[PDB]
Amino acid sequence: GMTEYKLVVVGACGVGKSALTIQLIQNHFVDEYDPTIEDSYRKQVVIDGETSLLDILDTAGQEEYSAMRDQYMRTGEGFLLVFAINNTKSFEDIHHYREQIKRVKDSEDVPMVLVGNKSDLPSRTVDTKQAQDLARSYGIPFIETSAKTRQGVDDAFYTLVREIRKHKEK
Ligand SMILES: *CCC(=O)N1CCN(c2ncnc3c(F)c(-c4ccccc4C(F)(F)F)c(Cl)cc23)CC1
Ligand SMILES: Nc1nc2c(ncn2[C@@H]2O[C@H](COP(=O)(O)OP(=O)(O)O)[C@@H](O)[C@H]2O)c(=O)[nH]1
Ligand SMILES: [Mg+2]
């Protein structure tokens, strides 16, 4: 079959994981998406001339560490680490999401992209430089997005695919 990429969107409640996912899948902004709905969406795309199937898991529900979740998360090939630029705690939480990915993958080299969402909002509390420095320390890209306007959304997911390709070449 055609190439597939298993992508996982992670980050604290309310950062815009679901809004980002629906923007990628359906090309419009959803104001309300139930925080208890965790689901995956597949979409056929062409990136750098390669046709692939993106299988995107939008994580949700509760903070719990079920066996299903670990196994589930283990199958992820790349991860979007999403915070919101107006929520400092969500940015501080990124360390947790990175470590948990590192724990379940048993690897220091997992495709990830740091995503600073809600870039449309004026009430910024997390400096772009701060995010850039963190991303550089992790050795990963940083992309600013707005699920509201769709700024950076394709770039975020497509950049993650490119990171997966880089990983697969090694
Ligand atoms: C508001 C609902 C929502 O969007 N979610 C609820 C909280 N939930 C969550 N919270 C805290 N830690 C999480 C976590 F560590 C994982 C996880 C588990 C196992 C391996 C990796 C990961 C990680 F996401 F990469 F961090 C998950 Cl799946 C969810 C966690 C998710 C968001
Ligand atoms: N202004 C703005 N609001 C957003 C953006 N992304 C998500 N939201 C809103 O923030 C809230 C949480 O979004 P949601 O997608 O449910 O976040 P999740 O809990 O990480 O899945 C919702 O009310 C969304 O409408 C964005 O880029 N800009
Ligand atoms: Mg959600």
UniProtKB/Swiss-Prot annotation:
One of its GO terms (biological process) is negative regulation of neuron apoptotic process. Changing Q62R: In a colorectal cancer sample; somatic mutation; promotes interaction with SHOC2 and PP1C. The modification N6-acetyllysine is found at K105. One of its GO terms (molecular function) is GTP binding. Acetylation at Lys-105 prevents interaction with guanine nucleotide exchange factors (GEFs). Lysine-depalmitoylation by SIRT2 promotes its localization to endomembranes in endocytic pathways. Changing Q62H: In lung carcinoma. It is a lipid-anchor. The keyword Signal does not apply. It catalyses: GTP + H2O = GDP + phosphate + H(+). One of its GO terms (cellular component) is membrane. CDD domains: H_N_K_Ras_like. SUPFAM superfamilies: P-loop containing nucleoside triphosphate hydrolases (SSF52540). Its EC number is 3.6.5.2. It holds the Pfam family Ras. Belongs to the small GTPase superfamily. Ras family. It is linked to Leukemia, acute myelogenous: A subtype of acute leukemia, a cancer of the white blood cells. AML is a malignant disease of bone marrow characterized by maturational arrest of hematopoietic precursors at an early stage of development. Clonal expansion of myeloid blasts occurs in bone marrow, blood, and other tissue. Myelogenous leukemias develop from changes in cells that normally produce neutrophils, basophils, eosinophils and monocytes. Ras proteins bind GDP/GTP and possess intrinsic GTPase activity. Plays an important role in the regulation of cell proliferation. Plays a role in promoting oncogenic events by inducing transcriptional silencing of tumor suppressor genes (TSGs) in colorectal cancer (CRC) cells in a ZNF304-dependent manner. Interacts with PHLPP. Interacts (active GTP-bound form preferentially) with RGS14. Interacts (when farnesylated) with PDE6D; this promotes dissociation from the cell membrane. Interacts with SOS1. Interacts (when farnesylated) with GPR31. Interacts with RAP1GDS1. Interacts (active GTP-bound form) with both SHOC2 and PP1c (all isoforms) to form a tertiary complex; SHOC2 and PP1c preferably bind M-Ras/MRAS, but they also bind K-Ras/KRAS, N-Ras/NRAS and H-Ras/HRAS. Interacts (GTP-bound form) with MAPKAP1/SIN1; inhibiting K-Ras/KRAS activity. This is GTPase KRas. The gene is KRAS.
